[PDB]
Design a protein around this ligand. Structure first.
Ligand code: ADP
Ligand code: ADP
Ligand code: RB8
Ligand code: RB8
Ligand code: MG
Ligand code: MG
Lengths: 302, 298
């Protein structure tokens, strides 16, 4: 089967369901609240595990109750946490998330400063044991080190190019597949027009560049041409982690088939189904539920 | 010795310090984070205790870590929690708060569905043991019952009239002093213009009506005539709980002096100093620090 490493952040999601996204200063009341594990690499690992892969998550937690809950949750999804570092006297990372009734979200992330950025401890891990290494940009040194070791071992690298304060140029160069979010690509290039931004991103790597655009689907460059995969329409409750699940599914599909069109289509299906349930994980389908959704899509109007 | 009861909510504040208030969907990074006790009545109790009063906090928590932390923190501030109800197998309330570099804040409160509104147990408490009862509007049945019992014992009632979903008319009627937030007054009256809203609020009560307006200060009515107290300019880090601290200070000052202008001025000073430090509580001054701060104005 497919052996996956996911390198990046694991954070506790504190999700507030509101009438509307709070645009202005004031007091608001949440209609509902859920506390669930998140973080791009960690949710991507859960997607890979749901889809049949043998999955390692490699990141950093504190020794607070949050840390032990984050890792226990990943283990219950079939994600192995043996390579995750526990810092002592450390808070784990967490986010406040506001989701409106259309499933659009504001995420405020607080990276715990007790989790050191040092990635040298990754050098003790044998990266040659995996078919694919996924990394998020939210642990910059972990992504740089993991992709360097993965390229040296001849293992495919897949980047979750989300928005982040630092420049991710050097992570993109180490990426076989650099799958940006719309905001991620805009921050990296400083260009708001997606088509021109994607051509600029392509100059940063010999790998493939993609950009996800929520319900507008996914664009990528292949044979010097602009490719496209529409989103699948579903009853959306929560788009939180759509990107994370898309990246997990894309890494599994790319490692399985090598086929960009079929892999992006597969990942779009998995991400669409995730959007139908609250949080990053409850809606994640297995391989069989995904193939039913994708193969019966053409037998009905949707 | 001022004896104060504060009736209302205690919630855990999860405060995110951001570059700017999110004006649209997306991913943002907080530069800093602090987790601190809050809730209007609970922070008002802390202000009262810092200002020398003997303070009871009367609210509801669960038996989760959050609940036990909220009460332990109040005890560490010198607030007595003996009358607070601890519900079995129940989660406590909490808020996510975003504070920008100017100290402006968005608060998202999640009221625990495990905390019963039932206020009948307040009947087992002798309300005559306090000089003043403060209540917030986020525990409506507790405020109604506590104000009813306080009025029956002849004890002064002070309302924190913040924004909340339910109509607070009946709480305002039971209020000797109804001190609204700008949003709270607008929600109650459905009038955006502060001057005509305050006159409309005055028709609901034989008490005094006030409205706080952040750095624009505080307005109130004395015999139909609008009084004003400007805010005191400070280096603002965080306006979270300014209202809460203002109400705690106002209740102590009213119970002490009964001069409205001097009480509002005092409470404005206490609230201004709170704004200089993160969260609802770290910046709360004692009586001596407040008098020093006020002496440098006219
Ligand atoms: N509203 C939606 N409806 C259906 N599919 C969606 C929706 N939002 C996202 N997806 C799927 O998930 C992918 C990634 O979502 P996107 O919002 O671009 O990522 P991120 O959450 O990282 O910003 C999309 O390209 C699409 O395949
Ligand atoms: N930026 C500020 N500078 C000085 N004083 C302030 C500031 N914000 C609030 N205060 C003081 O605290 C009082 C209550 O603050 P306000 O924002 O009106 O309450 P709330 O937090 O309930 O909205 C104000 O009337 C004022 O005296
Ligand atoms: O990427 S961050 O904002 O640092 C963390 C959040 O990202 C998600 O994984 C969604 O893509 C959430 O589950 C995290 O809170
Ligand atoms: O009033 S609520 O929004 O429910 C609770 C918040 O109010 C404050 O006390 C400030 O007024 C915060 O500390 C609470 O989170
Ligand atoms: Mg999205
Ligand atoms: Mg204010």
């Amino acid at each position: 089967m497919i052996r996956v490493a996911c390198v990046g952040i694991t954070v506790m999601d504190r999700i507030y369901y509101v009438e509307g996204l709070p645009t202005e200063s004031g007091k608001y009341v949440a209609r509902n609240y859920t506390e669930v594990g998140g973080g791009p690499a960690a949710t991507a690992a859960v997607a890979a595990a749901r889809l049949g892969a043998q999955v390692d998550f490699i990141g950093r937690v504190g020794d607070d109750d949050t840390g032990n809950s984050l890792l226990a949750e990943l283990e219950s999804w079939g994600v192995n946490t043996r390579y995750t570092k526990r810092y002592n006297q450390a808070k784990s990372s967490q986010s406040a998330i506001m989701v409106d009734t259309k499933g659009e979200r504001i995420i405020i992330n607080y990276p715990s400063p007790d989790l050191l950025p040092d990635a040298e401890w990754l050098e003790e891990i044998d990266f040659s044991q995996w078919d694919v290494v996924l990394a998020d940009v939210r642990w910059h040194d972990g992504a740089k080190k993991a992709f360097t070791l993965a390229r040296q071992a001849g293992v495919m690298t897949v980047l979750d190019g989300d928005i982040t304060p630092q420049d991710i140029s050097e992570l993109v160069a180490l990426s076989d597949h650099a799958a940006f979010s719309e905001p991620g690509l805009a921050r990296l290039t400083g260009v708001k027009e997606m088509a021109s931004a994607l051509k600029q991103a392509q100059t940063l790597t010999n790998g493939h560049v993609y950009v996800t655009q929520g319900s507008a689907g996914c664009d990528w460059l292949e044979n010097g041409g602009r490719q496209h995969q529409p989103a699948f329409k579903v009853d959306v409750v929560d788009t939180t982690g759509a990107g994370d699940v898309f990246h997990g599914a894309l890494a599994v599909a790319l490692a399985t088939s090598g086929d960009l069109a079929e892999s992006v289509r597969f990942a779009s299906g998995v991400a669409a189904l995730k959007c139908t349930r609250p949080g990053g994980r409850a809606g994640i389908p297995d391989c069989d539920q995904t193939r039913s959704f994708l193969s019966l899509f053409v037998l009905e109007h949707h």
